[PDB]
Amino acid sequence: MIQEQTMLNVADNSGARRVMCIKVLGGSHRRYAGVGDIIKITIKEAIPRGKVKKGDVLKAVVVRTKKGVRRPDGSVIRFDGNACVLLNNNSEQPIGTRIFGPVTRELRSEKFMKIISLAPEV
Amino acid sequence: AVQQNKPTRSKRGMRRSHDALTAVTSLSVDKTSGEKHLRHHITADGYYRGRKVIAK
Amino acid sequence: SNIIKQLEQEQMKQDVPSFRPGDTVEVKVWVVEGSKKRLQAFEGVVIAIRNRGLHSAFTVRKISNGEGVERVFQTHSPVVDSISVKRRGAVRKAKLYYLRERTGKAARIKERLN
Amino acid sequence: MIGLVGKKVGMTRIFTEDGVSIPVTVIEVEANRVTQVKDLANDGYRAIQVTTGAKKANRVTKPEAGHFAKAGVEAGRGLWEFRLAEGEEFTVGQSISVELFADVKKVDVTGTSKGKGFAGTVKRWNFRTQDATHGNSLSHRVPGSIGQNQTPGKVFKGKKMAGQMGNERVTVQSLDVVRVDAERNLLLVKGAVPGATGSDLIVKPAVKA
Amino acid sequence: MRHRKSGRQLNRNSSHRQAMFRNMAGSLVRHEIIKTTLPKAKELRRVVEPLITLAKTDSVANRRLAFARTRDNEIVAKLFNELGPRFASRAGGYTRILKCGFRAGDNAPMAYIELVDRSE
RNA sequence: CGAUGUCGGCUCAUCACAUCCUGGGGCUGAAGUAGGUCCCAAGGGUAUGGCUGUUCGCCAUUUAAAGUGGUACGCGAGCUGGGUUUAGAACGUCGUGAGACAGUUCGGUCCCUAUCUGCCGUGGGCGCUGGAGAACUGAGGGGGGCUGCUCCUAGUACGAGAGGACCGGAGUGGACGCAUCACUGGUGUUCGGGUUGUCAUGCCAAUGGCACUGCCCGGUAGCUAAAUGCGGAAGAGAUAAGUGCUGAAAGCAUCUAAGCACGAAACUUGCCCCGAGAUGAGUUCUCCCUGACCCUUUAAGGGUCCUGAAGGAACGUUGAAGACGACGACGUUGAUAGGCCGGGUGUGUAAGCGCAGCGAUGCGUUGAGCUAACCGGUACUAAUGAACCGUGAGGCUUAACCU
RNA sequence: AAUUCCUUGUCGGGUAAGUUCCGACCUGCACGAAUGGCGUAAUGAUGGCCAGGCUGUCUCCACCCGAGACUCAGUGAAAU
RNA sequence: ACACAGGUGGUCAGGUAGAGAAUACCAAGGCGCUUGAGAGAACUCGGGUGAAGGAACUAGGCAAAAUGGUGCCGUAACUUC
RNA sequence: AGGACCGAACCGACUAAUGUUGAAAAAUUAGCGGAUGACUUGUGGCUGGGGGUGAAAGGCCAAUCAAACCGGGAGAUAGCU
């Protein structure tokens, strides 16, 4: 499960295999992150085709978990990687032009549908 | 941190009052023979509950 | 008391397909999503036994591109369009956990066809 | 309005169209015999005794058999008492059933939790285990420091240590009536309740106008 | 702890209790009454009743069994011939327990275990 | 000074109130939202990451706050032991020098047969009085207590506007706390199957033991959290600060003196659990018993025989009840524990026989074979008559009724 | 700096930050050529700082096995 | 001090497996104990199991787990070659 | 060939854990390590009190040691207890 000091691959286009989870947020004491809810990330490698800097502090949201999406019936829909997508801290919204993720029901429960819907996978 | 002064001999009598061993009285007898046993084992004569269980 | 099993058979189906683990099940669903029904298809192999009445999980795994991509369907689920079993598996274990860390010719399943 | 008793058959998920999967607890309700009603000089109030089985007619004693003769001696599985106030009509002449819940939607259940009497600081009192390596001497399972030094001279009441767990009365209030059947004497309720599968549950209606 | 384990852990390691109760099964069929502690008399009933049930069928495929843990040269003709009609054909209840009293000079409870039928 | 462990690190308390946050609101250079300041209040609350012996400090991100103090600036018969404060080493300095040093680092122990006061579960007496049994009172104690996010009222009040609130009206979260095992994971050394080394049943097959449960691969029942369900209520009573009515001392005036009315996250209930040793030893219902004799002599005391109710105890079979005790189910007026029978879950198509293929191996008979906890069926094994304890209407009185 | 208070000097690099690490500098209150000077590899029961696998050290433990805690019998202490 | 988990000189080491004196089943050989019965809780000691995460723990990957055999391939800086 | 790489017998102290009124006058369990040497070892000797021995800690010198142990001067002396 995703938590503080976890290294992940990123769902943002031209993002590197390595970004670091520095805070799990929620204001109260928190163990692990949650799908469709925010997390604090630092960029540990930057790709020159991408739009981010190494060592920069950013806002993100969790978009796929090895724990799967499973609330309504207990029937799990599962993925073979843990990943988040990057959000702007003032203007809001996913900062990329493509997302590498399943873009499930709880991501369309956010204000983001216009920039995630190019490829629905479930 | 050690015992200072000796505990009372009435308190020794009361702590020893909690005994539960019995004088086994009366002992049970078989339905065909007046031979004694505790309420669930065989006699030392092979008699038990009017059934007879060990031959000679 | 067994009246709680009669309560699970209340929601179970009168007739349901059997395949057993490793078979190629070629599935279709209407999903409903608590809001709107729509046709979706999913294809892979069934990697778990059905099995315990109403709470049968019906777990299917795509096993492609070096990812497993696992999904629980439930065999008695009201959102199922069809199950179209078209190939046997050549497997002997029912839990199949060795397929979660293997790819291609190491996660092949094969056809039996015997 | 009084109360009723039945056995915890189990719990099974019922499923819903928009989520969640919802556990429903099933209660098998007995012919609650109404063995007694308290009236004359009984502390200015009225109360009924239910009875939850027939036990065995060979096992009875005369002080129980006479005390129950007014309805015949049965006294099985548990007696239990409920306060009879604002009930309008008298409970005697029929055995009480899930008809108590034919209009009611909310209930409170006294679950009686399954015993776990063995307890411990990690099992009961939610404390960690301390240092499996790096160095620690006989302080690996402890509720920390049980009292400050010198000046108090004594141990405080209400500390997070010792005692027993499970076997509490443990009420639950955030429940809902899912199905009633007066012909089968059967009750279904939403959510989980204390007490193991196969244990006896006490339930009373909850009402607010 | 033990919340569905109904097996008695008794005294000393499992591998002792195995060896001992597999030997005591051979000792019981030899003399048809044996004396020991009340706990040992009851713990000898475990898996030996299934072993008696196993000795009922006289088929050549069933004759392959009852042979892994308890062997003796003088049961070889009774096996798959007599243990059926004498015991296993009863369908359960192949033994009897009775406490005989206490052990000599000490507080240990003593009992005898016998087979449900005596030879005529 | 015949010997109070010191700094920092971990783990965990109790009291204040000089209030950081939470409830209340006053004054103001207070229109409104705010800021600045004031005091009624300690019931609930008051992070995390890097650097250092480390407090002290600094930095990054979180917050209703990132409050202060007492308790040897709380917790070594507490955990840790890097600094300071052991033997040895190694650098800078002063001195003729042993030494010395407002100069400094490397390696450096943390003991404890718990008596008494205390604390936390649990037996056994004495007691309410003739004995037993079933159950329930409430004098009193404990638990509980704060809060994040969003939406309606409402773009309402105030104000061109900018900006933007009380008041009550709901839904949804975390730490944290509780419960169940139903889902999802885990474990599950009474179990199904594969396999390397080897021994054993003559040998081969088939099959079992050992080698860490050999290696495992798995797992029912169970338990469990990382799983799921739920949680800190609504209401009532009474107050403080504070706001007031009516009004005399002060013919005016005045929250007070007489007499009336309101008010805070506080206070007390309600909630939830205990609770008559509440010796201030509560209360109803049901069950049972209708015997004589002797002595000193007496409304006191002692002895003898006769044979005993209601009920308990004893004993199993064993438990969802346990360290010992205490407690549940029932005991042939029998399903209390087990075996057996029909089946589940879980393993994986074996053996025996033949066939294809030099063969490994695969194929048919075969969804084979195998079973414990789960479900149902069954007296097949086991579960004393009842001994023993318990006896005979139970002392005095105030008041009424029945006789 | 094995030599340096204020000092974590002052600057650069690594880092969300870094009294630690790496590299420079001179203004060494007091290094200096046998009371030796300076540098180099395998190497070191050597010390500081990072990356990866692997992992119950930790989130957080949860359940087992073999031995003690319990109990009864036999033989039955010590410090105080 | 003891019929005490200790100390202690010389000679010997087969089969099957294996490089082997490692290591197991074994061989020849030996022993089944100088307290026994039972049980089983918070806790104490070691071993076994390990999901998802992983060095976050800690002064420190300490401790623990993973790696592990050898025939054929393929190999940096620095260097007293 | 080897003050050589790993490694039995052989040796042995570094980490960790258990033990600590013990089995124990220093062991036990697991691991890392020493193993042709500046080594180790069986057997018997030789080195002594300010003397020995020490690739040198005032460590070791039969548990003792900024000076061992026993027996004597010695019932030494104590403005003190």
Side-chain angles (χ1 to χ4, degrees):
Chain A
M1 294 176 285
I2 303 167
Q3 65 200 282
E4 289 191 10
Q5 297 178 333
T6 303
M7 192 80 79
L8 298 180
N9 189 15
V10 74
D12 180 34
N13 71 268
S14 296
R17 283 176 56 70
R18 56 195 282 91
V19 303
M20 176 59 75
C21 304
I22 63 159
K23 304 286 188 180
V24 292
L25 304 179
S28 301
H29 292 132
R30 179 174 275 168
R31 291 178 172 81
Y32 321 108
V35 65
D37 205 326
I38 64 172
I39 192 173
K40 201 84 178 190
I41 290 184
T42 61
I43 308 303
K44 294 293 191 172
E45 184 167 83
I47 311 302
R49 195 173 62 245
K51 206 176 291 183
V52 301
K53 182 189 168 287
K54 177 175 164 189
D56 196 28
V57 183
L58 296 174
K59 182 184 180 181
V61 62
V62 184
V63 298
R64 57 175 179 128
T65 55
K66 287 181 171 187
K67 195 174 184 174
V69 296
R70 61 197 286 186
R71 183 56 54 233
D73 292 278
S75 296
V76 191
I77 305 174
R78 208 183 291 260
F79 313 106
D80 279 81
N82 290 311
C84 309
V85 73
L86 302 179
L87 299 176
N88 183 278
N89 196 25
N90 177 62
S91 302
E92 307 179 306
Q93 305 288 338
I95 69 176
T97 43
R98 284 184 296 158
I99 189 172
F100 295 120
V103 299
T104 63
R105 192 159 179 73
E106 44 283 304
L107 194 64
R108 70 164 70 179
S109 301
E110 304 303 294
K111 66 162 69 182
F112 311 146
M113 192 71 175
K114 186 175 175 292
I115 197 51
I116 66 177
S117 303
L118 183 63
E121 311 204 329
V122 71
Chain B
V2 291
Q3 176 187 252
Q4 282 168 354
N5 178 252
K6 192 175 293 186
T8 76
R9 51 194 60 156
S10 52
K11 190 180 199 280
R12 193 188 74 166
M14 195 173 188
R15 85 192 192 201
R16 290 176 180 185
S17 79
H18 303 302
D19 78 272
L21 79 179
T22 81
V24 303
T25 294
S26 292
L27 290 162
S28 288
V29 297
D30 160 87
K31 297 184 171 183
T32 51
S33 61
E35 180 62 281
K36 290 169 178 165
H37 64 301
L38 287 173
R39 307 214 178 85
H40 185 227
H41 81 109
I42 72 184
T43 62
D45 206 58
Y47 276 79
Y48 179 67
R49 297 185 179 182
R51 300 178 180 167
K52 201 186 298 178
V53 294
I54 301 180
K56 301 183 183 178
Chain C
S1 46
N2 289 339
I3 62 175
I4 198 169
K5 299 285 173 289
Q6 285 152 235
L7 185 63
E8 281 178 18
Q9 293 180 15
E10 193 187 85
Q11 289 194 92
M12 289 171 62
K13 295 186 175 184
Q14 299 181 359
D15 187 76
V16 67
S18 198
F19 26 80
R20 309 192 286 163
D23 280 33
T24 292
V25 290
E26 217 187 59
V27 183
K28 306 188 191 79
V29 286
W30 305 307
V31 300
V32 187
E33 302 177 302
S35 52
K36 167 190 65 165
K37 78 195 303 173
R38 59 184 187 81
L39 185 65
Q40 167 181 96
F42 184 99
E43 64 170 284
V45 289
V46 65
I47 57 61
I49 201 172
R50 289 187 299 182
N51 198 23
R52 302 183 200 173
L54 184 63
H55 303 305
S56 295
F58 184 36
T59 317
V60 192
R61 197 169 172 107
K62 180 163 55 154
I63 315 179
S64 190
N65 189 37
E67 291 171 87
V69 189
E70 191 172 291
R71 182 163 168 185
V72 183
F73 284 90
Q74 302 191 34
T75 3
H76 294 278
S77 180
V79 308
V80 180
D81 171 284
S82 52
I83 303 171
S84 299
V85 194
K86 74 176 189 182
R87 210 182 77 240
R88 289 244 65 211
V91 295
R92 189 175 293 95
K93 300 175 188 276
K95 296 286 183 167
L96 300 172
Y97 301 138
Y98 66 93
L99 300 179
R100 305 200 290 210
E101 64 178 77
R102 292 181 184 180
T103 66
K105 309 190 191 182
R108 219 178 195 166
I109 306 104
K110 307 177 63 175
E111 72 285 311
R112 189 179 291 278
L113 189 63
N114 183 86
Chain D
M1 186 49 176
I2 62 163
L4 198 68
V5 185
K7 179 159 282 181
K8 188 176 174 178
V9 180
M11 192 171 64
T12 184
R13 287 155 64 247
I14 200 166
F15 307 120
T16 68
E17 297 174 61
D18 191 63
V20 295
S21 61
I22 302 183
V24 177
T25 295
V26 185
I27 311 181
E28 179 175 278
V29 184
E30 178 68 351
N32 277 240
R33 307 297 203 270
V34 194
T35 296
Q36 177 174 258
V37 58
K38 284 172 179 162
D39 179 34
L40 184 65
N42 297 118
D43 193 53
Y45 81 101
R46 293 182 161 189
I48 62 170
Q49 198 174 72
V50 295
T51 304
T52 56
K55 212 164 178 65
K56 290 193 189 180
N58 191 64
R59 302 191 70 91
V60 303
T61 61
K62 282 179 55 60
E64 285 195 319
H67 181 72
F68 306 130
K70 68 208 179 198
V73 55
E74 286 181 76
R77 182 163 53 134
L79 293 176
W80 294 295
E81 187 167 287
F82 303 111
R83 283 175 161 75
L84 179 63
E86 309 293 87
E88 187 55 38
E89 286 289 304
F90 218 48
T91 333
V92 302
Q94 287 186 97
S95 295
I96 59 175
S97 71
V98 300
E99 286 191 82
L100 185 62
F101 307 114
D103 226 301
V104 164
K105 190 56 148 61
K106 314 299 177 185
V107 297
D108 71 262
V109 180
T110 297
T112 303
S113 45
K114 75 195 291 191
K116 300 190 194 185
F118 59 90
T121 62
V122 189
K123 185 66 171 175
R124 192 178 187 212
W125 300 109
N126 304 346
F127 290 116
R128 69 175 301 145
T129 64
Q130 303 192 23
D131 299 285
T133 194
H134 311 298
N136 184 12
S137 299
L138 197 76
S139 290
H140 305 78
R141 286 185 169 239
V142 285
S145 291
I146 70 167
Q148 68 275 23
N149 71 321
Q150 301 290 273
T151 311
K154 67 212 173 285
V155 185
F156 294 101
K157 293 287 185 179
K159 286 281 174 188
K160 296 187 180 183
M161 67 189 188
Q164 64 188 333
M165 64 177 295
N167 185 252
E168 293 181 280
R169 303 286 183 132
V170 280
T171 54
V172 277
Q173 292 83 7
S174 292
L175 299 175
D176 193 63
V177 177
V178 186
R179 300 188 186 166
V180 176
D181 194 315
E183 188 176 294
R184 295 174 66 196
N185 202 18
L186 188 67
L187 178 65
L188 281 71
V189 296
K190 183 162 60 72
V193 309
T197 310
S199 301
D200 306 296
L201 296 175
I202 279 52
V203 60
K204 68 177 174 72
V207 294
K208 189 184 185 192
Chain E
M1 72 298 169
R2 307 196 295 168
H3 295 299
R4 181 50 53 237
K5 188 183 177 181
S6 294
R8 196 194 301 245
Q9 209 72 356
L10 189 73
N11 192 35
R12 291 185 277 281
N13 69 89
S14 299
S15 313
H16 181 208
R17 294 183 280 108
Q18 287 174 9
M20 188 187 71
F21 294 126
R22 291 164 194 185
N23 189 17
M24 289 175 77
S27 304
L28 174 59
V29 299
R30 181 166 277 277
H31 203 63
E32 307 185 21
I33 310 180
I34 68 171
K35 307 192 189 94
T36 194
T37 72
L38 181 66
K40 285 171 174 156
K42 291 189 180 179
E43 281 295 297
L44 185 58
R45 302 188 297 193
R46 290 174 66 209
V47 308
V48 179
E49 295 188 284
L51 182 63
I52 292 164
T53 306
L54 187 58
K56 191 182 176 184
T57 316
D58 80 296
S59 70
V60 293
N62 191 72
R63 286 171 58 194
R64 300 179 172 268
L65 303 182
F67 190 66
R69 294 167 175 191
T70 309
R71 297 178 185 171
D72 183 87
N73 192 49
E74 311 200 271
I75 65 174
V76 303
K78 290 183 175 195
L79 271 163
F80 318 107
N81 189 262
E82 297 190 44
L83 304 182
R86 295 181 182 284
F87 317 112
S89 295
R90 203 179 190 100
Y94 313 132
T95 73
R96 294 175 170 122
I97 310 298
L98 183 56
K99 190 169 70 184
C100 59
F102 291 98
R103 197 169 67 161
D106 83 292
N107 199 51
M110 299 301 288
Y112 74 90
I113 179 172
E114 67 176 314
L115 305 182
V116 75
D117 188 278
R118 293 179 185 193
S119 187
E120 295 188 79

